[PDB]
């Protein structure tokens, strides 16, 4: 099978600047290389066919070039709405194959997370469970560390994290971290802490509560 290798894995772009995405084929494929854009929750959208041929309605800022084994998608004056995955696909030989994708993200000023911590609800406690939830909202860049403590001591068991995709309006990221305990385990201890370490400060952002007074 033909293997398509894309470069870079991720592009972090300043809006208004131009960028270049690469796709290299393991065997010559002539001009038989197509480019797709895919936003999250949407299907792929054909941008360029046959290396360089335009597609009706696609903005002229997208163009393609190359031949043989070396192909390039150029985006002039990148807009914020160009954020998404970009894939190449060859049709020279069966089976058709795709590159692994280049993720285009938007660059923006560094931002610290807004951190909020939530005790277990009374309804969950009644059922015998106790989840403590921490939101780390609207930060940049995406790299962030979260640490839990119970009564001042580090805790890692029962933690599950989830990260959003980049926001379409402000180009930030958000993360949720959930510590799940049993009700009786939660009730045995007093203080709960969510601690975020992010590039924006050498000091962690610490949010804590005590179960009772």
């Amino acid at each position: 099978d033909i293997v398509l290798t894309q470069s870079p894995a991720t592009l972090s772009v300043t809006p208004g600047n131009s960028v270049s995405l690469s796709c290299r084929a393991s065997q010559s494929i002539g001009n038989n290389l197509h480019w797709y854009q895919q936003k999250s929750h949407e299907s792929p959208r054909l941008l360029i066919k046959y290396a360089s041929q335009s597609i009706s309605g696609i903005p002229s800022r997208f163009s393609g070039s190359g031949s043989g084994t070396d192909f390039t998608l150029s985006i002039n004056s990148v807009e914020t709405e160009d954020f998404g995955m970009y894939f190449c696909q060859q049709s020279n030989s069966w089976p058709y194959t795709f590159g692994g994708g280049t993720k285009l993200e938007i660059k923006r000023a560094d931002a610290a997370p807004t951190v909020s911590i939530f005790p277990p609800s009374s309804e969950q406690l009644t059922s015998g469970g106790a989840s403590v939830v921490c939101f780390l909202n609207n930060f940049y860049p995406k790299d962030i560390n979260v640490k839990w403590k119970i009564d001042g001591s580090e805790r890692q068991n029962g933690v599950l994290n989830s990260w959003t995709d980049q926001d379409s309006k402000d180009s930030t990221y958000s993360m949720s971290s959930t510590l799940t305990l049993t009700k009786d385990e939660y009730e045995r201890h007093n203080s709960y802490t969510c601690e975020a370490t992010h590039k924006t400060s050498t000091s962690p952002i610490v949010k804590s509560f005590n179960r009772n007074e």
Binding site: I29, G30, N31, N32, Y50, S67, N92, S93
Partner: peptide, 11 residues
């Protein structure tokens, strides 16, 4: 035809 990718298209 070579520029238009026909050489070795689908074998």
């Amino acid at each position: 035809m070579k520029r238009h990718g026909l050489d070795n298209y689908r074998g």
